[PDB]
């Protein structure tokens, strides 16, 4: 029920098909935050 | 400027700067912008200052000598270990938002 665009349609199709399985993805608000931090002279990145 | 009787980092007002340039000639280089801070910060040895601070803290012990020095030592150590260039603090290029 959040900004995960790829997750919303997936969950809707799952409910239509009665899957009831949750696929996380990763919220776009975090992407916005990362871009905003990078807009400053600040280095930030997500490792593995 | 070491030949000049001027410190490495001392404030020299506009008239003072002018007369100093007049009498010392073009020896004691000085600037008034962020270029000055960039040059001063990039021209130094972190290890030498850290060693000198450690020696000073070990030798001179006082209520004020104990403080205002250990924090500087920790800052120098963090900068050395993090590998971050101090000159990077003086930003040059500007990223913008999407």
Swiss-Prot record, chain A:
Q: Where is the signal peptide?
A: none
**Its domain of life?**
Bacteria
Biotechnology: applications noted:
Co-administration of salinamide and rifampicin or salinamide and myxopyronin suppresses the emergence of resistance to both antibiotics.
Q: How is it modified after translation?
A: Acetylated on several lysine residues in the presence of glucose.
Subunit composition?
Answer: The RNAP catalytic core consists of 2 alpha, 1 beta, 1 beta' and 1 omega subunit. When a sigma factor is associated with the core the holoenzyme is formed, which can initiate transcription. The rRNA transcription and antitermination complex (rrnTAC) consists of RNAP, NusA, NusB, NusE (rpsJ), NusG, SubB, ribosomal protein S4, DNA and precursor rRNA; S4 is more flexible than other subunits. In pull-down experiments interacts with CedA.
Q: Which family does it belong to?
A: Belongs to the RNA polymerase beta chain family.
What does the UniProt record say this protein does?
DNA-dependent RNA polymerase (RNAP) catalyzes the transcription of DNA into RNA using the four ribonucleoside triphosphates as substrates.
Report what the protein is called: DNA-directed RNA polymerase subunit beta
Lineage, uppermost ranks: Bacteria, Pseudomonadati, Pseudomonadota, Gammaproteobacteria, Enterobacterales
Whichever gene encodes this chain, its name is rpoB
Q: Which residues of the full protein are shown?
A: 1294 to 1341 of 1342
From Swiss-Prot, chain B:
Q: What does this protein do?
A: DNA-dependent RNA polymerase (RNAP) catalyzes the transcription of DNA into RNA using the four ribonucleoside triphosphates as substrates. Resistance to the antibiotics salinamide A, salinamide B, rifampicin, streptolydigin, CBR703, myxopyronin, and lipiarmycin can result from mutations in this protein.
Give the protein name, as stated in the record.
DNA-directed RNA polymerase subunit beta'
Q: Which family does the similarity line name?
A: Belongs to the RNA polymerase beta' chain family.
| Residues of the whole record sequence present | 149 to 246 of 1407
Q: How is it modified after translation?
A: Acetylated on several lysine residues in the presence of glucose.
Q: Which organism's genome codes for this protein?
A: Escherichia coli (strain K12)
Applications: Co-administration of salinamide and rifampicin or salinamide and myxopyronin suppresses the emergence of resistance to both antibiotics.
Its quaternary structure? The RNAP catalytic core consists of 2 alpha, 1 beta, 1 beta' and 1 omega subunit. When a sigma factor is associated with the core the holoenzyme is formed, which can initiate transcription. The rRNA transcription and antitermination complex (rrnTAC) consists of RNAP, NusA, NusB, NusE (rpsJ), NusG, SubB, ribosomal protein S4, DNA and precursor rRNA; S4 is more flexible than other subunits.
Lineage, highest ranks first: Bacteria, Pseudomonadati, Pseudomonadota, Gammaproteobacteria, Enterobacterales
């Amino acid at each position: 029920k959040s900004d995960d665009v790829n997750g919303r349609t997936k969950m809707y199709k799952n409910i239509v098909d009665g899957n009831h399985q949750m696929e996380p993805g990763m919220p776009e608000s975090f992407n916005v935050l990362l871009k905003e931090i990078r807009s400053l002279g600040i280095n930030i990145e997500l490792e593995d | 400027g070491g030949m000049t009787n001027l410190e490495r980092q001392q404030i020299l007002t506009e008239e003072q700067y002018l007369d100093a340039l007049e009498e010392f000639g073009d020896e004691f280089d000085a600037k008034m912008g962020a270029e000055a801070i960039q040059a001063l910060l990039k021209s130094m040895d972190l290890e030498q200052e850290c060693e000198q601070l450690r020696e000073e803290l070990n030798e001179t012990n006082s209520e004020t000598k104990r403080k205002k020095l250990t924090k500087r030592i920790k800052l120098l150590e963090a900068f050395v270990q993090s590998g971050n260039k101090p000159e990077w603090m003086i930003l040059t290029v500007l990223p913008v938002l999407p």
